Swiss-Prot record:
Lineage: superkingdom: Viruses
Name of the protein: Papain-like protease nsp3
Subcellular location: Host endoplasmic reticulum membrane
Membrane topology: Multi-pass membrane protein
Full protein stretch here: 1025 to 1191 of 7096
Function of the molecule: Responsible for the cleavages located at the N-terminus of the replicase polyprotein. Participates together with nsp4 in the assembly of virally-induced cytoplasmic double-membrane vesicles necessary for viral replication. Antagonizes innate immune induction of type I interferon by blocking the phosphorylation, dimerization and subsequent nuclear translocation of host IRF3. Also prevents host NF-kappa-B signaling. In addition, PL-PRO possesses a deubiquitinating/deISGylating activity and processes both 'Lys-48'- and 'Lys-63'-linked polyubiquitin chains from cellular substrates.
UniProt gene name: rep
Source organism: Severe acute respiratory syndrome coronavirus 2
Lineage: Viruses, Riboviria, Orthornavirae, Pisuviricota, Pisoniviricetes
Activity regulation: Inhibited in vitro by GRL-0617.
Length: 167
């Protein structure tokens, strides 16, 4: 039993809700919140900009030190950093950005990072400003993630479409 509330169950391990991931994280304080990161951990907009804003820019400060030490992530890769006031940990995961020309096949590799964590609150990778089809992202999530994932979808219209079209 966990504290996630109001989710629709899609499969044995995947759950979905129309919710603002920032507000959901602040309420649940999950062990892991997933950020829709880029390789530079520049949290300017989309989910990343919102999460970082909610940390009063502490996420960005921590991220800049991480990059100065380690260099950029790989597309499809991840790193674990602090969750600040939102969660114990933040798993920064880089899905391919279609608006940069990145290989959509890397979306499966990106979701594989979730399997290193027993339970996660997450957005749909590569959705939103990353330019991929969210219906496809949900399919890859369900077919790749084996751990327990609670998906927050900000847009109510998109949430309804994801549920109604789910096979
Ligand atoms: F400044 C802000 C502006 C917007 C929000 C809503 S969170 C959100 N944004 C974008 N895509 C998503 N996918 C799942 N949740 C989200 C929070 C803050 Cl703090």
């Amino acid at each position: 039993v966990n504290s996630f509330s109001g989710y629709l169950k899609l499969t044995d391990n995947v759950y979905i809700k129309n919710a603002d991931i920032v507000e959901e994280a602040k309420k649940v304080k999950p062990t892991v919140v997933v950020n829709a990161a880029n390789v530079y951990l520049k949290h300017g907009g989309g989910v990343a900009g919102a999460l970082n804003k909610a940390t009063n820019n502490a996420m960005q400060v921590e991220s800049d030190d991480y990059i100065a030490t380690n260099g950029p992530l790989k597309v499809g890769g991840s790193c674990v950093l602090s969750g600040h006031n939102l969660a114990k940990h933040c798993l920064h995961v880089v899905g391919p950005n279609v608006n940069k020309g990145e290989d959509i096949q890397l979306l499966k590799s990106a979701y594989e990072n979730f399997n290193q964590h027993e339970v996660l609150l997450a957005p749909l990778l590569s959705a939103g400003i990353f330019g991929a089809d969210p219906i496809h992202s949900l399919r890859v999530c369900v077919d790749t993630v084996r751990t327990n994932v609670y998906l927050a979808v900000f847009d109510k219209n998109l949430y309804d479409k994801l549920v109604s079209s789910f096979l």
